[PDB]
Design an enzyme around this catalytic site. Structure first.
Site, PDB file in Angstrom:
ATOM      1  N   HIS A   1      25.459   3.882  -1.739  1.00  0.00           N
ATOM      2  CA  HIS A   1      25.771   5.240  -2.227  1.00  0.00           C
ATOM      3  C   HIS A   1      24.642   6.288  -2.240  1.00  0.00           C
ATOM      4  CE1 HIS A   1      30.039   5.331  -2.969  1.00  0.00           C
ATOM      5  NE2 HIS A   1      30.014   4.208  -3.664  1.00  0.00           N
TER       6      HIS A   1
ATOM      7  N   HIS B   1      32.611  -1.446  -3.230  1.00  0.00           N
ATOM      8  CA  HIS B   1      33.526  -0.391  -3.593  1.00  0.00           C
ATOM      9  C   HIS B   1      33.926  -0.347  -5.066  1.00  0.00           C
ATOM     10  CE1 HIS B   1      36.932   2.283  -3.384  1.00  0.00           C
ATOM     11  NE2 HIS B   1      37.750   1.310  -3.744  1.00  0.00           N
TER      12      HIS B   1
ATOM     13  N   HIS C   1      35.385  -3.295   3.226  1.00  0.00           N
ATOM     14  CA  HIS C   1      34.853  -2.448   2.171  1.00  0.00           C
ATOM     15  C   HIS C   1      35.673  -2.553   0.889  1.00  0.00           C
ATOM     16  CE1 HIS C   1      32.817   0.950   0.298  1.00  0.00           C
ATOM     17  NE2 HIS C   1      34.013   1.390  -0.041  1.00  0.00           N
TER      18      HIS C   1
ATOM     19  N   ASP D   1      28.036  -1.404  -1.637  1.00  0.00           N
ATOM     20  CA  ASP D   1      27.783   0.025  -1.853  1.00  0.00           C
ATOM     21  C   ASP D   1      26.324   0.342  -2.170  1.00  0.00           C
ATOM     22  OD1 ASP D   1      30.793   1.504  -3.348  1.00  0.00           O
ATOM     23  OD2 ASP D   1      30.502   0.291  -1.528  1.00  0.00           O
TER      24      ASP D   1
ATOM     25  N   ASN E   1      35.307   3.803   1.785  1.00  0.00           N
ATOM     26  CA  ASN E   1      36.144   4.921   1.365  1.00  0.00           C
ATOM     27  C   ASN E   1      35.389   6.260   1.393  1.00  0.00           C
ATOM     28  OD1 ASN E   1      35.978   4.984  -2.225  1.00  0.00           O
ATOM     29  ND2 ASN E   1      34.784   3.647  -0.885  1.00  0.00           N
ATOM     30  N   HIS E   2      34.079   6.206   1.174  1.00  0.00           N
ATOM     31  CA  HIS E   2      33.249   7.410   1.131  1.00  0.00           C
ATOM     32  C   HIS E   2      32.820   7.944   2.502  1.00  0.00           C
ATOM     33  CE1 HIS E   2      32.320   8.349  -3.197  1.00  0.00           C
ATOM     34  NE2 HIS E   2      33.066   7.265  -3.294  1.00  0.00           N
TER      35      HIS E   2
HETATM   36 MN    MN Z   1      34.172   2.338  -1.868  1.00  0.00          MN
HETATM   37 MN    MN Z   2      32.527   2.907  -3.810  1.00  0.00          MN
END
Ligand code: MN
Ligand code: MN
Lengths: 376, 7, 306, 583
Positions: C56, C238, C164, C54, C114-115
């Site tokens: 982000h 994640h 992920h 990640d 997931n994002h």
């Molecule tokens: Mn994630």
């Molecule tokens: Mn995450």
């Protein structure tokens, strides 16, 4: 304060203790100096002494109490431990608590109980509860200790109701804070608590709502909706805003328009809020006034319905889920022409979130199944 | 801690 | 290819934090939309690689990541997903990483997190960031489509499983994942979801995820999922750990997390896992990059149309 | 009768439905006056867009940008006073982004008016804004004072001064904050007598404003007032106030003083600095708030650097330094780190003698600090202690500690020592380096963090530049060629990586017989990243080679590299052929 040395020569000691309990112990973030337990224990007994015995708050302790409170409370507040900018979210996290609370908790508690005594004569106290006293008390709502403001909230809220004199000054003073706030400091961490007070204050307005307050709603309250961090204090604001509209309905046009001009693009959680209180307003709307904004509203409203952001689209379309709001719409046909196209190009496919897909369907159904069987 | 979808 | 000279021009640009334009993105996302649909659910990845987790949107840290383990052509990569959310510079991160795909099409590999979804993307950072950086929900629209094409998982040297999130009770054979249709937004239930929404834990068996969805899974679940499938190691992101990388399930699964401490305002070191020629693992633990013009833009910020 | 197209047709935008339709009309107002009459603009357009647009503020932010550029598009200098009505209205708008521009627009256009037009138009404009109904007006006027002052009559000068006096005393803290801000700006529009007469009280009144958000703004402007030529005239007029601000119960004032402490010094003068600012600085460094000490330490060097004649060494020694040795061991992680940023420059000032005795037990202490950023700030400034303090004394104390840091956990720290190796191992290591530090300088090439390998690689082109060339062949290249065997491609890419940066300083002969025999040996590596960085690497080290020993030695290798697995090897061996001109 001992409640033991007969009746007189007792007022003589209380005043002695709240000079005694006034040489404050300037360091609680550096080590220990206990046997300042005396102070704590003693202002504890003073807090007991005034909430149990009749006729104890006599004329010459007011000055000595306010001095005690002011010497104890009116610090320069410290550099807020959490670094901030535009980057970090205002869900302000590292909540640095006041070091020396074990004394402050009581100083507040006492002085509040003082203010609360059945024989706290305010005509005697006003003499010593200055504007400058109010002013200091006020730049304290900026504390980052949630306990701290909680006290100030009730404390000031007492000082407000107790001193008609102070009220004008108080209002003007907590207006400037907001003006500082919304027009470019965008910082202050007490807008919530202050709004809570103003909540009650508005609710206590009068016969033909006085001019100063109308200004206060337009010049001050609505503009609060336009700051970065509306989240942290939205519900309270939302209250204050609706509060006016209960008392004086003629204010709806300016306060609804304001919102639409302050309507957020490029920040969605606020767009949701703006809808969330927008409906909160409609539930209190008088049919007379609904017309004045009926169009400019449903014009913007219709943009939301389409707007790709599901949270917005849902909340926007969920107006059609509440009977009164729906009554006003289908009491008009001018309403369902601005909302004709935005629920057609975004109607058949689109909106990946299939929840606002059946919602937009039930919306058109409840709109077409009205009086005006209109098509294009 | 910032919210549990997720510190 | 007279377009490939413009592409490393795009990359040269946005390596200084400055972003790409409305149309520049639309066709960048399109040229990557097609270079991606070629790849499979599990994506067999050539041996020498650096595996990242990640990031982000923490752009200047993604840069620190490259300063730590080589620049993007010269050292092979593989990301877990989650490029777009909690940070400040999502637009510049997901646009850099995608550009570094469609150019160096074998020198990096990007998986879906997931994002990389519509719903999360607009209930956290990204969508509103696109909204203040372009004025229209179009660059957001493009990126969310390219998200669909991102492969659900990867397989380095047929041995180390890169995905992920984690394991799912609706998968069994690795081939089960291959049989999925991932050309869609991530659902709330189902193999795909779990694949990129779940976590391991100290619990044993499948368990309920404290996250909205996914599943927790004990060391029993992955052990047996390993010993019959390929099975050296499972690698995931994640789920943040302050060491940056975390080793769990009698060393059956590592969690690699690649965004450090800022609006991951927790306090974690990030890390990457370097898989070398013979395929041994080393782990590089980086701290966040020093910043400048610091926390003060001198408070002369623009509004939000208001 | 006209053939071309330029004037006014293009837009379907003057009457609007949306927001950007209207916005793009005012953004393109830039060509509606030149497009139609620099005569009718004044006649009809301006009395139209006075305040007729009053819906959205984002439109008004653009309009203000326009009324600024309209300097000539209405006739020029003689015809500007018609811009005032729309901008006066624009100055009184709620939201600060609009009005903050409107002022800057009005500020720019005051200059191109006329001394007799300022008196009759611009000045009464200020009179009403400052005479404003509420604060948004008043905060604005505070800016427009400094520009129109010097040009108008001395009688209107007497009027304006009164208006500005009225804002410093404004009933609301918002205006006062504004008035307080532009106080320096205004006092700088000299009238020394009026600086003494009327500004000084303004200063001293704001300096002690009940709001700590105003006080601090007065120090910030003091630097001006105290720079406007008093002397035995500062001690009475603008000192007790400043001397007071140093002790102000608000840290936010105490701060402001330090964040300006060398400026005040430079304005106040050396005479007072020795007797009054010294103990203020002394005190500021010992503040309760660490954010003040921090801002106060970040200032030790510069304060010292401009003090006096013979006292300079003494003052720094007798009263400044005892504060530093206390601050280097300070609880805060931003004081030490700040003081570090400057303490090294305190060396030439005290000279050679005192540094060895007193500043050494401070660079060493600060070097081995718990905090990574502290030492990072020491290592950056080592050049200043190396230039004026003997190299023989440099190696006896710091070197052992510098060398330990050359292998610190933090790579940022490490790279700092590597940034420094040419100087350290040049002004010292004749034969000394390639026996005491060699295997240390080389070990950075085998580091696990890239940036070090890049710093270690860039290090060599310099480590052969200022150093030898036959010794490069004798130590540097032998261990660099060795590296080619490393099983990690990362690490064996550093072979090629050092090759193309060890070519510009080693020339033909060394390259052709020693480096190249490894490069077109490395083109057959299993990992494509080594293969395309051989083709990449051959391009760089091509011009170095002789035309013959690259036409048949560096051609059949590059053409076979266009012939297999990859799309990058099939590209770098392609664009290697292009530049080298081999096709
Ligand atoms: Mn994630
Ligand atoms: Mn995450």
């Amino acid at each position: 304060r001992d409640v033991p040395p007969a009746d007189q020569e007792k007022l003589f000691i209380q005043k002695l203790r709240q000079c005694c309990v006034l040489f404050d112990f300037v360091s609680d973030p550096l080590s220990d100096l206990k046997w300042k337990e005396v102070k704590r224990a003693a202002l504890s007994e003073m807090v007991e002494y005034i909430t149990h015995n009749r006729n104890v708050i006599t004329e010459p302790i007011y000055p000595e109490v306010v001095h005690m409170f002011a010497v104890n409370m009116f610090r320069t507040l410290p550099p807020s431990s959490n670094p901030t900018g535009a980057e970090f979210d205002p869900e302000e996290d590292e909540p640095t608590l006041e070091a020396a609370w074990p004394h402050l908790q009581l100083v507040y508690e006492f002085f509040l109980r003082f203010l609360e005594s059945p024989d706290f004569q305010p005509n005697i106290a006003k003499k010593y509860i200055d504007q400058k006293f109010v002013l200091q008390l006020l730049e304290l709502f900026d504390s980052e200790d949630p306990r701290e403001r909680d006290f100030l909230k009730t404390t000031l809220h007492r000082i407000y109701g107790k001193f008609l004199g102070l009220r004008a000054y108080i209002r003007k003073q907590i207006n400037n804070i907001f003006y500082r706030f919304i027009y470019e400091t965008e910082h202050h961490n007490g807008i919530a608590e202050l709004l809570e007070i103003l909540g009650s204050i508005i609710n206590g307005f009068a016969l033909p709502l006085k001019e100063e307050h109308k200004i206060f709603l337009l010049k001050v309250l609505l503009p609060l909706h336009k700051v970065k961090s509306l989240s942290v204090y939205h519900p309270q604001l939302a209250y204050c805003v609706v509060q006016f509209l209960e008392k004086d309905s003629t204010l709806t046009e300016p306060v609804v328009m304001a919102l639409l001009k302050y309507w957020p693009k490029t920040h969605s959680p606020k767009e949701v809020m703006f809808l969330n209180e927008l409906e909160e307003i409609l539930d209190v709307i008088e049919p007379s006034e609904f017309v004045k904004i009926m169009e400019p509203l449903f014009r913007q409203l219709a943009k939301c319905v389409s707007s790709p952001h599901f949270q917005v689209a849902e909340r926007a379309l969920y107006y059609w889920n509440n009977e009164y709001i729906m009554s006003l719409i289908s009491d008009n046909a001018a309403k369902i022409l601005p909302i004709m196209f935005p629920s057609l190009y975004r109607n058949s496919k689109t909106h990946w979130n299939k929840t606002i897909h059946g919602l937009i369907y039930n919306a058109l159904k409840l709109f077409m199944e009205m009086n005006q069987k209109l098509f294009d | 801690x910032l919210x549990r979808x997720x510190x | 290819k007279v377009f490939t000279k413009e592409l490393d021009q795009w990359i040269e640009q946005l390596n200084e934090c400055k972003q790409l334009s409305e149309s520049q993105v639309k066709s960048l996302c399109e040229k990557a939309k097609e270079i991606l649909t070629k790849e499979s659910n599990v994506q067999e990845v050539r041996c020498p690689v650096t595996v990242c987790g990640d990031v982000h949107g923490q752009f200047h840290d993604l840069m620190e990541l490259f300063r730590i383990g080589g620049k993007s052509p010269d050292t092979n990569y593989l990301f877990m997903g989650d490029y777009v959310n909690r940070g400040y510079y999502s637009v510049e991160t997901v646009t850099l990483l995608v550009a570094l795909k469609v150019r160096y099409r074998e020198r990096i590999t990007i998986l879906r997190g997931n994002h990389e979804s519509r719903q999360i993307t607009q209930v956290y950072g990204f969508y509103d960031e696109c909204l203040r950086k372009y004025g229209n929900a179009n660059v957001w629209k493009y990126f969310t489509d390219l998200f669909d094409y991102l492969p659900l998982t990867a397989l380095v040297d047929g041995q180390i499983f890169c995905l992920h999130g984690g394991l799912s009770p609706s998968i069994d054979t690795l081939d089960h994942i291959r049989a999925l249709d991932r050309l869609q937004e991530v659902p709330h239930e189902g193999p795909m979801c779990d694949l990129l929404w779940s976590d391991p834990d100290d619990r044993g068996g499948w368990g309920i995820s404290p996250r909205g969805a996914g599943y927790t899974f004990g060391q029993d679940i992955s052990e047996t999922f390993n010993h019959a499938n390929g099975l050296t190691l499972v690698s995931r992101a994640h789920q943040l750990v302050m060491e940056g990388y975390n080793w769990c399930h009698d060393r059956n699964v590592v969690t690699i997390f690649s965004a450090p401490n800022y609006c991951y305002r927790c306090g974690n070191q990030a890390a990457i896992m370097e898989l070398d020629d013979t395929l041994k693992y080393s782990f590089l633990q980086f701290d966040p990059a020093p910043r400048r013009g610091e926390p003060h833009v001198t408070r002369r910020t623009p509004d939000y149309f208001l | 009768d006209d053939s071309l197209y330029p004037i006014a047709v293009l837009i379907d935008e003057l009457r609007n439905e949306d927001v950007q339709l209207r916005l793009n009309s005012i953004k393109k107002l830039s060509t509606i006056a030149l497009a139609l009459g620099v005569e009718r603009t004044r006649s009809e357009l301006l009395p139209f867009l006075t305040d007729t647009i009053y819906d959205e503020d984002e439109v008004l932010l653009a309009l203000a940008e326009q009324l600024g550029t309209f300097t000539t598009l209405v006739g020029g200098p003689e015809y500007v006073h018609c811009l005032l009505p729309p901008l006066e209205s624009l100055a009184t708008v709620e939201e600060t982004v609009v009005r903050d521009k409107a002022v800057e627009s009005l500020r720019a256009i005051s200059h191109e008016h006329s001394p007799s037009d300022l008196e009759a138009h611009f000045v009464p404009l200020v009179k009403r804004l400052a005479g404003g109904d509420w604060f948004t007006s008043r905060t604005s006027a505070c800016g427009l004072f400094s520009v129109c002052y010097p040009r108008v009559s001395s009688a209107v000068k007497a009027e304006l001064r009164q208006y500005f006096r009225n804002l410093c005393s404004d009933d609301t803290p918002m205006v006062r904050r504004a008035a307080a801000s532009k106080l320096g700006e205004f006092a700088k529009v000299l009238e020394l007598d009026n600086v003494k007469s009327e500004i000084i009280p303004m200063f001293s009144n704001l300096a002690s404003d009940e709001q700590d958000s105003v006080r601090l703004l007065a120090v910030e402007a003091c630097v001006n007032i105290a720079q406007l030529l008093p002397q035995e005239d500062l001690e009475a007029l603008v000192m007790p106030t400043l001397r007071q601000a140093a002790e102000d119960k608000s840290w936010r004032v105490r701060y402001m003083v330090a964040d300006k402490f060398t400026e005040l010094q430079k304005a106040v003068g050396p005479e007072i600095t020795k007797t009054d600012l010294v103990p203020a600085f002394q005190n500021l460094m010992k503040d309760c708030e660490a954010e003040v000490r921090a801002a106060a330490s970040h200032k030790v060097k510069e304060f010292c650097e401009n003090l006096s004649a013979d006292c300079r060494e003494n003052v720094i020694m007798t009263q400044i330094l005892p504060c530093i040795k206390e601050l280097v061991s300070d609880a805060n992680q931003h004081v030490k780190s700040a003081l570090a940023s400057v303490i090294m420059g305190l060396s030439p000032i005290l000279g050679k003698d005192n540094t060895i005795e007193h500043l050494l037990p401070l660079f060493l202490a600060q070097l081995k600090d718990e905090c990574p950023e502290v030492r990072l700030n020491i290592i950056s400034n080592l050049d200043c202690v190396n230039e004026v303090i003997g190299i023989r004394q440099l190696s006896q104390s710091l070197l052992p500690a510098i060398v330990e840091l050359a292998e610190d956990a933090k790579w940022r720290v490490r790279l700092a020592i590597i940034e420094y190796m040419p100087l350290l191992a040049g002004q010292l290591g004749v034969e000394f380096f390639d026996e005491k530090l060699n295997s240390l300088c080389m070990a950075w090439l085998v580091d696990h963090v890239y940036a070090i390998r890049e710093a270690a690689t860039s290090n060599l082109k310099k480590l052969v530049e200022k150093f030898g060339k036959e010794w490069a062949h004798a130590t540097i290249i032998p261990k660099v060629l060795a590296m080619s065997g490393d099983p990690n491609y990362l690490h064996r890419m550093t072979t090629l990586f050092c090759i193309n940066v060890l070519s510009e300083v080693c020339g033909q002969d060394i390259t052709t017989k020693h480096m190249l025999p490894t490069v077109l040996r490395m083109a057959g590596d299993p990992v494509a990243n080594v293969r395309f960085n051989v083709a990449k690497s051959l391009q760089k080290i091509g011009p170095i080679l002789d035309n013959s020993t690259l036409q048949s030695e560096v051609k059949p290798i590059l053409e076979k590299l266009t012939q297999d697995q990859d799309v990058d090897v099939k590209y770098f061996a392609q664009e290697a052929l292009t530049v080298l001109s081999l096709a």
